[PDB]
Design an enzyme around this catalytic site. Structure first.
Site, PDB file in Angstrom:
ATOM      1  N   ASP B  34     -16.545   0.393 -39.870  1.00  0.00           N
ATOM      2  CA  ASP B  34     -16.828   0.786 -41.255  1.00  0.00           C
ATOM      3  C   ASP B  34     -16.930   2.301 -41.486  1.00  0.00           C
ATOM      4  OD1 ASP B  34     -17.448   0.800 -43.933  1.00  0.00           O
ATOM      5  OD2 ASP B  34     -19.517   0.162 -43.665  1.00  0.00           O
ATOM      6  N   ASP B 230     -12.706   4.095 -47.031  1.00  0.00           N
ATOM      7  CA  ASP B 230     -13.703   3.078 -46.688  1.00  0.00           C
ATOM      8  C   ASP B 230     -13.106   1.786 -46.103  1.00  0.00           C
ATOM      9  OD1 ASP B 230     -15.873   1.305 -46.547  1.00  0.00           O
ATOM     10  OD2 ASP B 230     -16.570   1.690 -48.580  1.00  0.00           O
TER      11      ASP B 230
HETATM   12  C1  LIG Z   1     -14.411  -5.624 -44.874  1.00  0.00           C
HETATM   13  C2  LIG Z   1     -14.871  -6.062 -46.265  1.00  0.00           C
HETATM   14  C3  LIG Z   1     -14.896  -7.580 -46.381  1.00  0.00           C
HETATM   15  C4  LIG Z   1     -15.023  -8.048 -47.837  1.00  0.00           C
HETATM   16  N1  LIG Z   1     -16.120  -7.421 -48.588  1.00  0.00           N
HETATM   17  C5  LIG Z   1     -17.393  -8.141 -48.493  1.00  0.00           C
HETATM   18  C6  LIG Z   1     -17.452  -9.423 -49.340  1.00  0.00           C
HETATM   19  C7  LIG Z   1     -17.348  -9.141 -50.841  1.00  0.00           C
HETATM   20  C8  LIG Z   1     -17.852 -10.318 -51.681  1.00  0.00           C
HETATM   21  C9  LIG Z   1     -15.748  -6.536 -49.545  1.00  0.00           C
HETATM   22  O1  LIG Z   1     -14.579  -6.220 -49.760  1.00  0.00           O
HETATM   23  N2  LIG Z   1     -16.598  -5.565 -49.902  1.00  0.00           N
HETATM   24  C10 LIG Z   1     -17.377  -4.818 -49.091  1.00  0.00           C
HETATM   25  C11 LIG Z   1     -18.053  -3.872 -49.849  1.00  0.00           C
HETATM   26  C12 LIG Z   1     -19.027  -2.913 -49.257  1.00  0.00           C
HETATM   27  O2  LIG Z   1     -19.957  -2.458 -49.913  1.00  0.00           O
HETATM   28  N3  LIG Z   1     -18.844  -2.592 -47.962  1.00  0.00           N
HETATM   29  C13 LIG Z   1     -19.743  -1.742 -47.183  1.00  0.00           C
HETATM   30  C14 LIG Z   1     -19.859  -2.419 -45.798  1.00  0.00           C
HETATM   31  C15 LIG Z   1     -19.827  -3.940 -45.782  1.00  0.00           C
HETATM   32  C16 LIG Z   1     -18.966  -4.598 -44.906  1.00  0.00           C
HETATM   33  C17 LIG Z   1     -18.912  -5.997 -44.859  1.00  0.00           C
HETATM   34  C18 LIG Z   1     -19.737  -6.745 -45.698  1.00  0.00           C
HETATM   35  C19 LIG Z   1     -20.612  -6.092 -46.571  1.00  0.00           C
HETATM   36  C20 LIG Z   1     -20.664  -4.697 -46.614  1.00  0.00           C
HETATM   37  C21 LIG Z   1     -19.410  -0.247 -47.172  1.00  0.00           C
HETATM   38  O3  LIG Z   1     -20.234   0.363 -46.181  1.00  0.00           O
HETATM   39  C22 LIG Z   1     -19.690   0.418 -48.517  1.00  0.00           C
HETATM   40  N4  LIG Z   1     -19.372   1.870 -48.524  1.00  0.00           N
HETATM   41  C23 LIG Z   1     -20.023   2.579 -49.684  1.00  0.00           C
HETATM   42  C24 LIG Z   1     -21.530   2.400 -49.708  1.00  0.00           C
HETATM   43  C25 LIG Z   1     -22.187   1.938 -50.850  1.00  0.00           C
HETATM   44  C26 LIG Z   1     -23.575   1.769 -50.827  1.00  0.00           C
HETATM   45  C27 LIG Z   1     -24.299   2.054 -49.665  1.00  0.00           C
HETATM   46  C28 LIG Z   1     -23.644   2.510 -48.521  1.00  0.00           C
HETATM   47  O4  LIG Z   1     -24.273   2.808 -47.378  1.00  0.00           O
HETATM   48  C29 LIG Z   1     -25.623   2.335 -47.129  1.00  0.00           C
HETATM   49  C30 LIG Z   1     -22.264   2.683 -48.557  1.00  0.00           C
HETATM   50  C31 LIG Z   1     -17.678  -4.069 -51.171  1.00  0.00           C
HETATM   51  C32 LIG Z   1     -18.023  -3.441 -52.365  1.00  0.00           C
HETATM   52  C33 LIG Z   1     -17.454  -3.866 -53.562  1.00  0.00           C
HETATM   53  C34 LIG Z   1     -16.541  -4.916 -53.566  1.00  0.00           C
HETATM   54  C35 LIG Z   1     -16.190  -5.550 -52.374  1.00  0.00           C
HETATM   55  C36 LIG Z   1     -16.763  -5.118 -51.177  1.00  0.00           C
END
Ligand SMILES: CCCCN(CCCC)C(=O)n1cc(C(=O)N[C@@H](Cc2ccccc2)[C@H](O)CNCc2cccc(OC)c2)c2ccccc21
Ligand SMILES: CCCCN(CCCC)C(=O)n1cc(C(=O)N[C@@H](Cc2ccccc2)[C@H](O)CNCc2cccc(OC)c2)c2ccccc21
EC number: 3.4.23.46
Lengths: 387, 387
Positions: B34, B230
């Protein structure tokens, strides 16, 4: 071939011409380079648009063939009297040829005021020569009588903006390389498509895209009833069904700004505030051409900087104005001067093929360039020609 | 870096993960890569979706920091207990790091059923670490404690079709090269954009095109309130206004076929008869990024093969089905895994820059490829960054 580089002048709307001499002593004349016909003809009588003409009585080497000739083109017509005489190209190969010449005595809508040319050099094959195929075309005479290799290449250079009378006279309009290929005139690789038949320079288009989107027509429609490379015609010309599909698609791709139907009819100008032409809203057009290798094809891609033809803003403003340089045809596809301006085009008569490369003088912007790319091996092909 | 090549598994929809070991004796866990966060965390208690978890009591090298930690992401959250332990990457550099590790004891919508990962490796900077910036992120610890260069690069490889459970386990999902760049993972040139600020991997987008057509917005709107690379997010996410303009333009370009509102909302699939997906009707998307050189930029271009995410049919069939992998954001632009799948991405921390090159494993067709191209100099890019 440095001696022949930059030997052309003119522009797409009026034609590109080369200097020639005819007769003894030499009579200098500017001659339109036309890959779409096969007669060598010159003004031979006073005409409002001609500042000079061929004076047969003044040439000691003139030979009268005692035979009339009538040539109707898609646009314009002339009649004349057939003869032969000695001909040279001052900025071509150092040779003199005895060639057929039609001395033009009458014409309708043929000569163009201010174009600075007085005759036409039909560079295609005998099959389409008038009165018939026994009248040997200039290029055939040149090859038979001299050691010039059986090929030529054209770099037509559009400015990207309007040129006035004195500007057209003072600029280089491109190059006709007689007997060869000049590597300074292009970039990247030269891709070849077969000449289908030696009459016009006839080729076969296997696919058409507008901004990558397939027109999705039976490929036969693109070549109905032929597709030719034609330097003596300004526009890209397309069969009715292809034209309607292309225009509809181009209108759709550029739909953020609306234009008069007169514009899409190729007759009306569109103008924009100086420098603000929105090139980015207009799509690129890719024409896929049959390759030398079986089941293979390549594409040529042109920009709106090719198919939007720069014209004068005669009003009291600094606007940049253009005409839509795609037109409807009832006699097949015509790849005219605005298309040729994107590319270095090799008319390899010896090997019965036409080469395309990105031209070193094509007009573009920093975001897009014209392209010649291949190969494509998945295309439905073979029967794209018309019979 | 042959030992590190092909060390990832997974897919954009569920995440790409690397094998790690924690503790003594080594406990093997699969860890989501990540770039969008900075906490290293592992399941440390039974969960319906975990086949294995970190057992601290069985690790002789475990150190308990006696401090809780809570991490809310945009999607999902977890709570856990902080400590340190020895960590290795079997198919990474031959090193052992003592690193901070959050032992996850409670979570909500974080772990993904069938994903095959049990924790997360936050690769971004301390500034966004929880509980605060004094909790040294894993990569920092790695660089400090070893001779590994301060650089890593990611090649996320999308299959271009759906992968069942068996297939995703048997398939290679790409490469994370720690400490360098593998030249076999990309073609053409690597182009570098500056990291604006070391918190997220923040970048600046200066221009957006759909099929060469400028979205025509002030560049601030593209970076409101930030733009980040990301890997822990599936989709390209765009600020509300950019998203609305992009979707309107994507709809217009693809208007020969009509799609339900729920498709454009990213919610519902569209399906086509096997093999007939009309890629050509969908436009390419270019994002222009700030260059290292002043008043210079470059562009990365993706295909619908990137922004249409392959999914299994709801009623299993031989159809090819996809969801629209572009979503609306209230927290700035997110260049998610579907974007990263087009490119080999170099996170050059030592030189505070991110490198992009066309991925050797990107999905395309015979007519179009992803691209990384430049330079461009006519772009006005002053206040593109948001403050
Ligand atoms: C591989 C992804 C699989 C699919 N998935 C999950 C399921 C959705 C229903 C998905 O697509 N999303 C994953 C999102 C997300 O927030 N991911 C964070 C890590 C993570 C990985 C895997 C699961 C949960 C989280 C990442 O660190 C955020 N970066 C900015 C940030 C923001 C705030 C605080 C912070 O730090 C404390 C960093 C996400 C966001 C919006 C839409 C879809 C999203
Ligand atoms: C150089 C560009 C000047 C602009 N111009 C003229 C002025 C229009 C207002 C113009 O664009 N057009 C020129 C056209 C045309 O018919 N040109 C022929 C040569 C020529 C050069 C210069 C003047 C007249 C003619 C060419 O040889 C036909 N090839 C196929 C062919 C067909 C039949 C017989 C045949 O063999 C006998 C060969 C033309 C056609 C349609 C629209 C616009 C057209």
């Amino acid at each position: 071939f440095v001696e022949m580089v930059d030997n052309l002048r003119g522009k797409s709307g009026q034609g590109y011409y080369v200097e020639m001499t005819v007769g003894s002593p030499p009579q200098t004349l500017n001659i339109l380079v036309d890959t779409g016909s096969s007669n060598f003809a010159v003004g031979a009588a006073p005409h409002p648009f001609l500042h000079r003409y061929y004076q047969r009585q003044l040439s000691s080497t003139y030979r009268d063939l005692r035979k009339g000739v009538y040539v109707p083109y898609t646009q314009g017509k002339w009649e004349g009297e057939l003869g032969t005489d000695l001909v040279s190209i001052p900025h071509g190969p150092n040779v003199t040829v005895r060639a057929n010449i039609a001395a033009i005595t009458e014409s309708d809508k043929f000569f163009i005021n201010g174009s600075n040319w007085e005759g036409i050099l039909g560079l295609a094959y005998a099959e389409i020569a008038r009165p018939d195929d026994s009248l040997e075309p200039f290029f055939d005479s040149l090859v038979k009588q001299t050691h010039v290799p059986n090929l030529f290449s054209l770099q037509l250079c559009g400015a990207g903006f309007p040129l006035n009378q004195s500007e057209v006279l003072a600029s280089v309009g491109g190059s006709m390389i007689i007997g060869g290929i000049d590597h300074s005139l292009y970039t990247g690789s030269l891709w070849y498509t077969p000449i289908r038949r030696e009459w016009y320079y006839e080729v076969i288009i296997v696919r058409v895209e507008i901004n990558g989107q397939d027109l999705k027509m039976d490929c036969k429609e693109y070549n109905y009833d032929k597709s030719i490379v034609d330097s003596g015609t300004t526009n890209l010309r397309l069969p009715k069904k292809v034209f309607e599909a292309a225009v509809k698609s181009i209108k759709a791709a550029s739909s953020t700004e609306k234009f008069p139907d007169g514009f899409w009819l190729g007759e009306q100008l569109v103008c924009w505030q100086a420098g603000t032409t929105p090139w980015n809203i207009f799509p690129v057009i890719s024409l896929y051409l049959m390759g030398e290798v079986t089941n293979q094809s390549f594409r040529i891609t042109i920009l709106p900087q090719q198919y939007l033809r720069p014209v004068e803003d005669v009003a009291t403003s600094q606007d940049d104005c253009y005409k839509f340089a795609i037109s409807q045809s009832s006699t097949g596809t015509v790849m005219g001067a605005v298309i040729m301006e994107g590319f270095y085009v090799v008319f390899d008569r010896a090997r019965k093929r036409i080469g395309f490369a990105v031209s070193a003088c094509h007009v573009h912007d920093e975001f897009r360039t014209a392209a010649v790319e291949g190969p494509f091996v998945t295309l439905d092909m073979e029967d794209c020609g018309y019979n």
